């Protein structure tokens, strides 16, 4: 409702995807870090991509 053609969909998808990736990695790493399991964010970022 704010932006026009290939800007409402383009920018809206970027915001949703960036927000989803940040929360998905945090949620996954919250589980392993509470159990003392250390995994590099590289591996989780590959799955979440």
């Amino acid at each position: 409702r704010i932006l026009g053609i290939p800007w409402g969909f383009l920018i809206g998808a970027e915001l949703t995807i960036v927000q989803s990736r940040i929360s998905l990695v945090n949620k996954i790493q919250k589980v392993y870090r509470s159990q003392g399991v250390q995994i590099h964010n590289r591996h989780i970022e590959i799955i979440v991509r």
Binding site: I2, L3, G4, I5, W7, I11
Partner: peptide
């Protein structure tokens, strides 16, 4: 009535306008 419709402006393809509204 159609006179009042005539003031509504479409901005399709105007990147500079959408950049201003993005800011």
């Amino acid at each position: 009535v159609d006179e009042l419709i005539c003031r509504i402006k479409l901005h399709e393809g105007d990147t500079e306008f959408w950049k201003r509204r993005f800011l």
